[PDB]
Design an enzyme around this catalytic site. Structure first.
Site, PDB file in Angstrom:
ATOM      1  NE  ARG B 123      -3.990  -2.099   2.180  1.00 52.27           N
ATOM      2  CZ  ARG B 123      -3.808  -2.918   3.209  1.00 52.27           C
ATOM      3  NH1 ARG B 123      -2.802  -2.726   4.058  1.00 52.27           N
ATOM      4  NH2 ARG B 123      -4.638  -3.944   3.381  1.00 52.27           N
ATOM      5  CE  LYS B 145      -1.447  13.114 -14.577  1.00 49.51           C
ATOM      6  NZ  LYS B 145      -1.850  13.752 -15.856  1.00 49.51           N
ATOM      7  CD  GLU B 187       5.794  14.502 -23.520  1.00 47.71           C
ATOM      8  OE1 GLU B 187       5.130  15.554 -23.429  1.00 47.71           O
ATOM      9  OE2 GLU B 187       5.275  13.376 -23.366  1.00 47.71           O
ATOM     10  CE  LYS B 243       4.906  16.480 -15.334  1.00 48.13           C
ATOM     11  NZ  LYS B 243       5.039  15.212 -16.107  1.00 48.13           N
ATOM     12  CD  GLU B 253      -4.785  15.520 -15.868  1.00 48.19           C
ATOM     13  OE1 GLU B 253      -4.477  14.370 -15.486  1.00 48.19           O
ATOM     14  OE2 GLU B 253      -4.691  15.884 -17.063  1.00 48.19           O
ATOM     15  NE  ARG B 257       0.275  16.292 -13.633  1.00 47.30           N
ATOM     16  CZ  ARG B 257       0.944  15.477 -12.827  1.00 47.30           C
ATOM     17  NH1 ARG B 257       0.619  15.373 -11.543  1.00 47.30           N
ATOM     18  NH2 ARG B 257       1.952  14.764 -13.311  1.00 47.30           N
ATOM     19  CG  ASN B 261      -2.667  14.785 -20.783  1.00 43.66           C
ATOM     20  OD1 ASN B 261      -2.706  13.619 -21.176  1.00 43.66           O
ATOM     21  ND2 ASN B 261      -2.367  15.113 -19.528  1.00 43.66           N
ATOM     22  CG  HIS B 264      -0.087  13.923 -24.217  1.00 44.34           C
ATOM     23  ND1 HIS B 264       0.614  15.019 -24.665  1.00 44.34           N
ATOM     24  CD2 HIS B 264       0.812  13.130 -23.592  1.00 44.34           C
ATOM     25  CE1 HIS B 264       1.884  14.892 -24.329  1.00 44.34           C
ATOM     26  NE2 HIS B 264       2.030  13.755 -23.678  1.00 44.34           N
ATOM     27  CG  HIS B 268      -1.985   9.235 -24.483  1.00 45.95           C
ATOM     28  ND1 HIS B 268      -2.249  10.085 -23.430  1.00 45.95           N
ATOM     29  CD2 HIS B 268      -0.701   8.834 -24.328  1.00 45.95           C
ATOM     30  CE1 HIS B 268      -1.172  10.192 -22.672  1.00 45.95           C
ATOM     31  NE2 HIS B 268      -0.218   9.444 -23.196  1.00 45.95           N
ATOM     32  CG  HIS B 280       4.794   9.203 -25.038  1.00 50.20           C
ATOM     33  ND1 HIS B 280       3.423   9.114 -24.929  1.00 50.20           N
ATOM     34  CD2 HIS B 280       5.148  10.339 -24.397  1.00 50.20           C
ATOM     35  CE1 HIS B 280       2.968  10.154 -24.256  1.00 50.20           C
ATOM     36  NE2 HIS B 280       3.995  10.913 -23.925  1.00 50.20           N
TER      37      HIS B 280
HETATM   38  N1  LIG Z   1       4.801  10.154 -15.817  1.00 51.65           N
HETATM   39  C1  LIG Z   1       4.529  11.067 -16.749  1.00 51.65           C
HETATM   40  O1  LIG Z   1       3.898  12.065 -16.466  1.00 51.65           O
HETATM   41  C2  LIG Z   1       5.010  10.870 -18.154  1.00 51.65           C
HETATM   42  C3  LIG Z   1       5.348  11.945 -18.973  1.00 51.65           C
HETATM   43  C4  LIG Z   1       5.785  11.691 -20.272  1.00 51.65           C
HETATM   44  C5  LIG Z   1       5.879  10.375 -20.721  1.00 51.65           C
HETATM   45  N2  LIG Z   1       5.535   9.354 -19.916  1.00 51.65           N
HETATM   46  C6  LIG Z   1       5.643   7.959 -20.343  1.00 51.65           C
HETATM   47  O2  LIG Z   1       7.019   7.668 -20.545  1.00 51.65           O
HETATM   48  C7  LIG Z   1       7.151   6.599 -21.471  1.00 51.65           C
HETATM   49  C8  LIG Z   1       8.294   6.947 -22.411  1.00 51.65           C
HETATM   50  O3  LIG Z   1       9.521   6.935 -21.681  1.00 51.65           O
HETATM   51  P1  LIG Z   1      10.923   7.082 -22.461  1.00 51.65           P
HETATM   52  O4  LIG Z   1      10.670   7.948 -23.667  1.00 51.65           O
HETATM   53  O5  LIG Z   1      11.993   7.504 -21.486  1.00 51.65           O
HETATM   54  O6  LIG Z   1      11.211   5.592 -23.006  1.00 51.65           O
HETATM   55  P2  LIG Z   1      12.110   4.480 -22.262  1.00 51.65           P
HETATM   56  O7  LIG Z   1      11.995   4.620 -20.762  1.00 51.65           O
HETATM   57  O8  LIG Z   1      11.778   3.149 -22.889  1.00 51.65           O
HETATM   58  O9  LIG Z   1      13.607   4.831 -22.742  1.00 51.65           O
HETATM   59  C9  LIG Z   1      13.919   4.915 -24.129  1.00 51.65           C
HETATM   60  C10 LIG Z   1      14.938   3.862 -24.573  1.00 51.65           C
HETATM   61  O10 LIG Z   1      16.263   4.361 -24.410  1.00 51.65           O
HETATM   62  C11 LIG Z   1      17.014   3.566 -23.489  1.00 51.65           C
HETATM   63  N3  LIG Z   1      17.779   4.512 -22.650  1.00 51.65           N
HETATM   64  C12 LIG Z   1      17.318   5.283 -21.647  1.00 51.65           C
HETATM   65  N4  LIG Z   1      18.315   6.052 -21.133  1.00 51.65           N
HETATM   66  C13 LIG Z   1      19.422   5.774 -21.829  1.00 51.65           C
HETATM   67  C14 LIG Z   1      20.818   6.226 -21.808  1.00 51.65           C
HETATM   68  N5  LIG Z   1      21.216   7.155 -20.907  1.00 51.65           N
HETATM   69  N6  LIG Z   1      21.663   5.679 -22.713  1.00 51.65           N
HETATM   70  C15 LIG Z   1      21.263   4.755 -23.607  1.00 51.65           C
HETATM   71  N7  LIG Z   1      20.003   4.305 -23.675  1.00 51.65           N
HETATM   72  C16 LIG Z   1      19.065   4.767 -22.829  1.00 51.65           C
HETATM   73  C17 LIG Z   1      16.011   2.708 -22.754  1.00 51.65           C
HETATM   74  O11 LIG Z   1      16.589   1.457 -22.378  1.00 51.65           O
HETATM   75  C18 LIG Z   1      14.937   2.553 -23.806  1.00 51.65           C
HETATM   76  O12 LIG Z   1      15.291   1.524 -24.727  1.00 51.65           O
HETATM   77  C19 LIG Z   1       5.793   6.438 -22.147  1.00 51.65           C
HETATM   78  O13 LIG Z   1       5.218   5.176 -21.783  1.00 51.65           O
HETATM   79  C20 LIG Z   1       4.960   7.611 -21.646  1.00 51.65           C
HETATM   80  O14 LIG Z   1       3.578   7.302 -21.429  1.00 51.65           O
HETATM   81  C21 LIG Z   1       5.122   9.583 -18.664  1.00 51.65           C
HETATM   82  N1  LIG Z   2      -9.472  -3.600   4.601  1.00 46.76           N
HETATM   83  C1  LIG Z   2      -9.618  -4.007   5.865  1.00 46.76           C
HETATM   84  O1  LIG Z   2      -9.409  -3.231   6.780  1.00 46.76           O
HETATM   85  C2  LIG Z   2     -10.048  -5.414   6.185  1.00 46.76           C
HETATM   86  C3  LIG Z   2     -10.466  -5.747   7.474  1.00 46.76           C
HETATM   87  C4  LIG Z   2     -10.856  -7.055   7.751  1.00 46.76           C
HETATM   88  C5  LIG Z   2     -10.832  -8.004   6.734  1.00 46.76           C
HETATM   89  N2  LIG Z   2     -10.424  -7.665   5.497  1.00 46.76           N
HETATM   90  C6  LIG Z   2     -10.414  -8.652   4.415  1.00 46.76           C
HETATM   91  O2  LIG Z   2     -11.767  -9.037   4.157  1.00 46.76           O
HETATM   92  C7  LIG Z   2     -11.825 -10.391   3.724  1.00 46.76           C
HETATM   93  C8  LIG Z   2     -12.904 -11.123   4.517  1.00 46.76           C
HETATM   94  O3  LIG Z   2     -14.156 -10.531   4.186  1.00 46.76           O
HETATM   95  P1  LIG Z   2     -15.563 -11.269   4.429  1.00 46.76           P
HETATM   96  O4  LIG Z   2     -15.471 -12.048   5.715  1.00 46.76           O
HETATM   97  O5  LIG Z   2     -16.653 -10.240   4.316  1.00 46.76           O
HETATM   98  O6  LIG Z   2     -15.638 -12.298   3.178  1.00 46.76           O
HETATM   99  P2  LIG Z   2     -16.548 -12.161   1.841  1.00 46.76           P
HETATM  100  O7  LIG Z   2     -16.588 -10.735   1.352  1.00 46.76           O
HETATM  101  O8  LIG Z   2     -16.090 -13.222   0.867  1.00 46.76           O
HETATM  102  O9  LIG Z   2     -18.023 -12.599   2.317  1.00 46.76           O
HETATM  103  C9  LIG Z   2     -18.221 -13.850   2.972  1.00 46.76           C
HETATM  104  C10 LIG Z   2     -19.162 -14.799   2.217  1.00 46.76           C
HETATM  105  O10 LIG Z   2     -20.517 -14.501   2.545  1.00 46.76           O
HETATM  106  C11 LIG Z   2     -21.264 -14.078   1.403  1.00 46.76           C
HETATM  107  N3  LIG Z   2     -22.088 -12.919   1.826  1.00 46.76           N
HETATM  108  C12 LIG Z   2     -21.706 -11.648   2.042  1.00 46.76           C
HETATM  109  N4  LIG Z   2     -22.764 -10.901   2.449  1.00 46.76           N
HETATM  110  C13 LIG Z   2     -23.835 -11.700   2.510  1.00 46.76           C
HETATM  111  C14 LIG Z   2     -25.263 -11.570   2.855  1.00 46.76           C
HETATM  112  N5  LIG Z   2     -25.794 -10.394   3.244  1.00 46.76           N
HETATM  113  N6  LIG Z   2     -26.039 -12.671   2.772  1.00 46.76           N
HETATM  114  C15 LIG Z   2     -25.548 -13.863   2.388  1.00 46.76           C
HETATM  115  N7  LIG Z   2     -24.258 -14.045   2.064  1.00 46.76           N
HETATM  116  C16 LIG Z   2     -23.378 -13.025   2.102  1.00 46.76           C
HETATM  117  C17 LIG Z   2     -20.247 -13.818   0.310  1.00 46.76           C
HETATM  118  O11 LIG Z   2     -20.779 -14.138  -0.976  1.00 46.76           O
HETATM  119  C18 LIG Z   2     -19.106 -14.733   0.704  1.00 46.76           C
HETATM  120  O12 LIG Z   2     -19.299 -16.060   0.198  1.00 46.76           O
HETATM  121  C19 LIG Z   2     -10.418 -10.950   3.890  1.00 46.76           C
HETATM  122  O13 LIG Z   2      -9.810 -11.082   2.605  1.00 46.76           O
HETATM  123  C20 LIG Z   2      -9.662  -9.936   4.724  1.00 46.76           C
HETATM  124  O14 LIG Z   2      -8.270  -9.839   4.387  1.00 46.76           O
HETATM  125  C21 LIG Z   2     -10.049  -6.410   5.212  1.00 46.76           C
HETATM  126  N1  LIG Z   3       3.392  14.448 -20.569  1.00 46.21           N
HETATM  127  C1  LIG Z   3       2.567  13.643 -19.629  1.00 46.21           C
HETATM  128  C2  LIG Z   3       1.283  14.398 -19.285  1.00 46.21           C
HETATM  129  C3  LIG Z   3       0.726  14.101 -17.898  1.00 46.21           C
HETATM  130  C4  LIG Z   3       1.204  15.077 -16.836  1.00 46.21           C
HETATM  131  O1  LIG Z   3       2.421  15.156 -16.598  1.00 46.21           O
HETATM  132  O2  LIG Z   3       0.352  15.757 -16.230  1.00 46.21           O
HETATM  133  C5  LIG Z   3       2.237  12.269 -20.223  1.00 46.21           C
HETATM  134  O3  LIG Z   3       2.646  11.940 -21.340  1.00 46.21           O
HETATM  135  O4  LIG Z   3       1.566  11.444 -19.598  1.00 46.21           O
HETATM  136 ZN   LIG Z   4       3.684  12.777 -22.777  1.00 51.27          ZN
END
Ligand SMILES: NC(=O)c1ccc[n+]([C@@H]2O[C@H](COP(=O)([O-])OP(=O)(O)OC[C@H]3O[C@@H](n4cnc5c(N)ncnc54)[C@H](O)[C@@H]3O)[C@@H](O)[C@H]2O)c1
Ligand SMILES: NC(=O)c1ccc[n+]([C@@H]2O[C@H](COP(=O)([O-])OP(=O)(O)OC[C@H]3O[C@@H](n4cnc5c(N)ncnc54)[C@H](O)[C@@H]3O)[C@@H](O)[C@H]2O)c1
Ligand SMILES: N[C@@H](CCC(=O)O)C(=O)O
Ligand SMILES: [Zn+2]
Ligand SMILES: O=C(O)C1=C[C@@H](O)[C@@H](O)[C@H](O)C1
Ligand SMILES: O=C(O)C1=C[C@@H](O)[C@@H](O)[C@H](O)C1
Ligand SMILES: O=C(O)C1=C[C@@H](O)[C@@H](O)[C@H](O)C1
Ligand SMILES: *[C@H]1C=C(C(=O)O)C[C@@H](O)[C@@H]1O
Ligand SMILES: *[C@H]1C=C(C(=O)O)C[C@@H](O)[C@@H]1O
Ligand SMILES: [Zn+2]
Lengths: 227, 554, 213, 113
Positions: B123, B145, B187, B243, B253, B257, B261, B264, B268, B280
């Site tokens: 988580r 992102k 970009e 940015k 966003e 933000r 895009n 994009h 995209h 990309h």
């Molecule tokens: N998070 C965001 O907001 C955001 C913004 C823009 C793009 N993106 C995402 O980013 C992705 C594109 O990333 P990218 O363009 O970096 O591609 P990439 O991460 O695949 O890198 C490009 C290629 O160059 C190589 N490479 C990287 N650095 C190198 C270096 N120093 N020397 C030699 N080779 C190198 C990598 O191994 C790869 O083959 C897309 O999937 C796009 O959606 C995300």
């Molecule tokens: N996120 C948290 O904080 C938290 C806390 C405790 C447990 N959990 C998770 O929850 C899971 C256990 O949940 P659960 O005990 O609700 O199991 P579940 O959601 O599978 O429900 C138990 C069974 O009873 C049935 N059922 C549910 N409501 C019903 C109703 N009103 N009448 C007849 N049948 C019904 C379902 O179909 C199922 O077969 C575990 O995976 C555990 O890790 C999470």
């Molecule tokens: N350039 C970014 C836009 C998203 C952002 O940074 O807000 C992308 O390709 O995903």
């Molecule tokens: Zn982009």
């Protein structure tokens, strides 16, 4: 290598296999003078550095895609699952690029299933040859009877129509060739003087694979056929 | 000169040179203490950049601290549900606990995938970004992102998850391939186009110099980039700051933000069809051009801006159209039908329900709104479609005033004779053609006139120098501008001998097989030396720096 | 006597009786307006509790608003990477956009899985909790812990993602099987054991009477 | 059905029907397994002399074919239990062997049990 590649092209070979590992300057030169030869862009992974699931083949696929008319990727299976992953991979690639077909295999006895399921231009062995090109490759007949055991080649009914056909050798002929080639089909008698409504039940059945027609039905059959 | 940049209330971005193998290891251990550090990159990067970091890190780290390493396959296909599980299952093999600090070393593919792993592992755990591509330094590593692709389209599943640190080591650009450089410039162009018309103008001038350096075969990969080291620093700092500020104002966003895009919405959609073979930034370039053309159709953007944006994109060797020959070559002629593109745009994350939202430029450096604007499907269809269905009918009793684009015959002349004159002229309705753009730069380098724009580029202010021009030592590249080569051949004969006795006009491969024989015959006859440098009766041509023609009969 | 409970600065938990088929539909439409509502439960719950909610909801909802429904297989095996993808791919089939409001109807398995889908779908969308097991009413639906299991162990991949609403309709306990009741009492005992010796003492006295009923 | 392995239900041609549609016979599955790597072939031998006119190879090879196995049986004439013999016997390809005159007694020391 270059000179050997050109010897292939000059000889007017229908397919030519260049490896994607070859340097770019040769990939260009062979591609430019390919003419009506189909290029099989290949890569083999005998040391098993690549993986179907993980997508470490993509870089080679991407390269083979722009150089080859046919992509050929060959890896290694360690376990049966490795063939599933290959089949899944191939399917995803053909969906994305319909227009460039693929030969995809796993080597080793574990990957024998990938040869069966490949379908398109599967490389095969033959008992009369001194070796096998790769270890654990199956013959066309073996693969074909493997495909039959799984129902990928569904059995079919073949018939001889006419009379008298009690002493006809056609059933012996075709059943033998079915067995010899690895097919699961079966050929049988069906004596009849006329092209009946009961005959066209067999002919239009989905089990129908084909049929020989002899006296007196060579002429009377034509109206029942489409073309 | 290690400059830091503030994002979300803290200076967690640092931009320096050669920090991967010293500063980064130490900063992790001191500011993000943990029992377990997980360094993940791709197969292309691993053996070059990981082993030396391990040496440095394991020398500095204390007794009970460990560094785990892993490489995934490179490229878009690794932003996937599988690769995610592959990494996670591996981490759990080594009992990585919640205190784990993840190090994303690579480009945006690594940044997005590993960031999303970080966002969801137990988580959420701490991670940092070490961008190695231009794109990632100026865009991907900043903003938090993270996402993966599904078969449906781009980045459809993911998480907002901010890295504790973003280490931008400009030195990674040294080994980056030419294609990936050009990819990231998309970009960079985008960011300038929505935010800063002055940076935009710089990108125009720097284009020729950047590509030349990137494609250079110089004695080392570092010396290769040295001539444009200042330009790259300006681009990275500048683009990262925009940015960072946009992200600070609007992390999740809700509005502002959207602007990042630009290109994009449509980009995209192409990328969902053309990836992984088409990159990309390449798709963003194509999308930027269509989203500009869309804005133009909607009357929100002036045509001159669309031409100017397209020309910039093209001047960095990016595609302007999905029909680019390189896209066909890479994609094996993969088709992008409109119905499929619209189907991909229906799951664009800016969309408010069925309403598609697209960033509309109002001008270069401005956006129509400070967010994405609702556009009708019909208009988006028209731009993506190859053919037009024309509904008959025009309003009863209509009367309109329409101005078509300027005539290139009269516009090309206007620039020449304004530049040669004394005084200052404002030229309205000038067609900003390739002939004008190259003649303008030509005369600038000849010190023949001072040029300047007004009303967002619709008026050209020309202060001519009365014919006192200076012979340029450097040759004047013209591209395949016919009217330009013809006009400049006689114009550059007017310039007095300054640095060199002569001055040379060159251009495109297509220009070099283009006739200028009769005009050169006229200049030789009228006392102006001129020798052909490659092919006879065509450019390139070295033409003498006389004080004009001899005169008299011609 | 509909009592609300404050969590993270707002009274977003409501505990009443028979709110699923009236209050909940209306509260969603009024406090969490959207073009698209996605109601996900399991196969055991679907045909009993979903169709009547659809009737109520689609009667109240305005013209341009839609309710999508989906059932996953019941039980722990559905807190998985696959089931996650199965739900997500389905949502994307119907062009669910970012304004989507997800309704987790079920116990903790639904709560955790659907919540995690909500946490990551387009980098996060709004969702609510409608717990139907004792466990989920007293524990799972509150707190915003969403996760999936991997082969390694429990809840190892997930996200903190708070529901906008937690609708606790005590009436769901009527159809809940005996085993699932006893199952949830473990979490009730736990909470008392760490926090309140007086409630603990009540649980001792009430045990005989609860099981009997 | 081929890949199941454990207690796969099968048909047989002599029965009037198949219990389920498209079930394979034990022999068919076994030869399907052989075509994929799952039943690895094995060498079977006849040790002794004279075994030129021995029917064992005909016997066992026929049963291999009849049962759907990919194994093969062959001659190996020898008067003594040699070091070359125990190469075959201890090979991982070894499936089993018949032993006749004069090796029925002299073989025992080479065997474990
Ligand atoms: N998070 C965001 O907001 C955001 C913004 C823009 C793009 N993106 C995402 O980013 C992705 C594109 O990333 P990218 O363009 O970096 O591609 P990439 O991460 O695949 O890198 C490009 C290629 O160059 C190589 N490479 C990287 N650095 C190198 C270096 N120093 N020397 C030699 N080779 C190198 C990598 O191994 C790869 O083959 C897309 O999937 C796009 O959606 C995300
Ligand atoms: N996120 C948290 O904080 C938290 C806390 C405790 C447990 N959990 C998770 O929850 C899971 C256990 O949940 P659960 O005990 O609700 O199991 P579940 O959601 O599978 O429900 C138990 C069974 O009873 C049935 N059922 C549910 N409501 C019903 C109703 N009103 N009448 C007849 N049948 C019904 C379902 O179909 C199922 O077969 C575990 O995976 C555990 O890790 C999470
Ligand atoms: N350039 C970014 C836009 C998203 C952002 O940074 O807000 C992308 O390709 O995903
Ligand atoms: Zn982009
Ligand atoms: O009796 C037969 O086997 C046949 C006799 C000829 O008429 C052939 O033309 C026919 O195809 C087969
Ligand atoms: O003198 C001019 O400006 C021109 C004249 C014609 O040849 C045109 O075709 C040409 O494009 C430009
Ligand atoms: O000649 C033969 O094939 C044989 C002869 C007998 O010794 C048998 O006991 C032996 O198994 C086979
Ligand atoms: C390609 C693949 C082969 C195989 O692995 O079966 C045989 C080889 O000769 C072909 O070139
Ligand atoms: C179980 C399964 C069968 C099959 O489907 O192959 C045959 C049936 O008779 C067995 O009970
Ligand atoms: Zn619990």
């Amino acid at each position: 290598a270059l000179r050997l590649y050109q010897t292939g092209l000059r000889s007017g070979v229908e397919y030519l296999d260049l490896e994607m590992t070859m340097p770019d300057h040769i990939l260009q030169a062979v591609t430019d003078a390919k003419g009506f030869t189909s290029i099989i862009a290949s890569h083999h992974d005998p040391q098993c550095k690549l993986s179907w699931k993980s997508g470490s083949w993509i870089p080679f696929y991407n390269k083979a895609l722009q150089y080859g008319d046919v992509i050929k990727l060959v890896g290694v299976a360690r376990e049966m699952a490795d063939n599933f992953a290959l089949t899944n991979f191939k399917a995803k690639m053909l969906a994305a690029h319909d227009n460039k077909p693929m030969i995809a295999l796993n080597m080793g006895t574990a990957g024998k299933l990938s040869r069966v399921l490949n379908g398109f231009l599967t490389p095969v062995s033959h008992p009369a040859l001194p070796s096998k090109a790769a270890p654990g490759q199956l013959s066309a007949t073996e693969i074909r009877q493997a495909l039959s055991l799984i129902g990928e080649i569904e059995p079919k009914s073949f018939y001889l129509f006419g009379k008298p056909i009690s002493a006809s050798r056609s059933p012996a002929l075709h059943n033998t060739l079915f067995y010899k080639t690895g097919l699961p089909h079966h050929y049988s008698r069906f004596e009849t003087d006329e092209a009946s409504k009961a005959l066209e039940s067999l002919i239009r059945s989905p089990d129908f694979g084909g049929a020989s027609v002899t006296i007196p039905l060579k002429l009377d059959i034509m109206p029942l056929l489409d073309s | 000169e290690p400059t830091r940049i503030a994002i979300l209330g803290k200076e967690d971005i640092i931009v320096d040179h050669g920090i991967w193998l010293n500063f980064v290891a130490h900063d992790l251990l001191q500011t993000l203490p943990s029992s377990t550090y997980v360094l993940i990159t791709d197969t292309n990067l691993y053996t070059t950049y990981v082993p030396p970091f391990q040496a440095v890190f394991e020398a500095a780290a204390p007794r009970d601290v460990r560094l785990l390493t892993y490489a995934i396959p490179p490229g878009e296909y690794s932003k996937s549900r599988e690769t995610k599980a592959e990494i996670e299952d591996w981490m759990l093999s080594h009992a990585c606990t919640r205190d784990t600090v993840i190090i994303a070393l690579g480009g945006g593919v690594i940044g997005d995938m590993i960031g999303y792993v970080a966002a969801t592992f137990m988580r959420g755990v701490r991670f940092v970004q070490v961008p190695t591509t231009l794109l990632a330094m100026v865009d991907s590593s900043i903003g938090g992102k993270t996402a993966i692709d599904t078969p449906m389209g781009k980045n459809l599943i993911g998480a907002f998850w901010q890295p504790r640190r973003i280490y931008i080591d400009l030195a990674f650009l040294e080994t980056l391939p030419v294609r990936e450089f050009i990819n990231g410039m998309a970009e960079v162009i985008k960011t300038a186009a929505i935010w800063n018309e002055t940076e935009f103008t710089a990108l125009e001038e720097n284009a020729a110099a950047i590509l030349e350096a990137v494609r250079s075969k110089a004695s080392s990969p570092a010396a290769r980039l040295a001539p444009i080291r200042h330009i790259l620093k300006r681009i990275v700092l500048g683009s990262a700051r925009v940015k960072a500020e946009v992200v600070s104002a609007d992390e999740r966003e809700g509005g502002l933000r959207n602007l990042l895009n630009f290109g994009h919405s449509i980009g995209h959609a192409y990328e969902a069809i053309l990836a992984p073979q088409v990159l990309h930034g390449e798709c963003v370039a194509i999308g930027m051009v269509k989203e500009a053309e869309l804005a133009r159709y909607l009357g929100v953007l002036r045509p001159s801006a669309v031409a100017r944006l397209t020309k910039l994109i093209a001047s960095y060797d990016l595609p302007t159209s999905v029909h680019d020959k390189r896209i066909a070559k890479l994609s094996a002629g993969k088709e992008c039908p409109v119905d499929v593109l619209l189907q991909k745009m229906a799951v664009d994350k800016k969309n408010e329900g069925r309403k598609k939202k697209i960033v509309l430029l109002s001008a270069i450096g401005k956006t129509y709104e400070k967010k994405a604007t609702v556009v009708d499907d019909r208009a988006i269809r028209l731009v993506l479609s190859p053919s037009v269905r024309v509904t008959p009918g025009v309003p009863k009793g209509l009367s309109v005033t329409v101005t078509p684009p300027g005539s290139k015959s009269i516009s090309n002349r206007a620039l020449v004779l304004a530049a040669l004159g004394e005084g200052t002229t404002r030229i309205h309705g000038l067609l900003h053609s390739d002939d004008v753009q190259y003649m303008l730069a030509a005369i600038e380098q000849l010190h023949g006139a001072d040029f300047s724009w007004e009303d967002a580029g619709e008026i050209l202010v020309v202060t001519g120098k009365g014919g006192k021009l200076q012979a340029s030592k450097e040759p004047l590249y013209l591209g395949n501008a016919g009217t330009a080569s013809r006009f400049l051949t006689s114009v550059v004969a007017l310039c007095a001998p300054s640095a060199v006795s002569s001055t040379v006009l060159t251009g495109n491969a297509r220009m070099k097989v283009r006739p200028i024989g009769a005009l050169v015959d006229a200049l030789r006859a009228n006392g102006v030396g001129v020798k052909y440098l490659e092919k006879e009766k065509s450019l390139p041509v070295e033409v003498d720096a006389a004080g004009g023609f001899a005169g008299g009969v011609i």
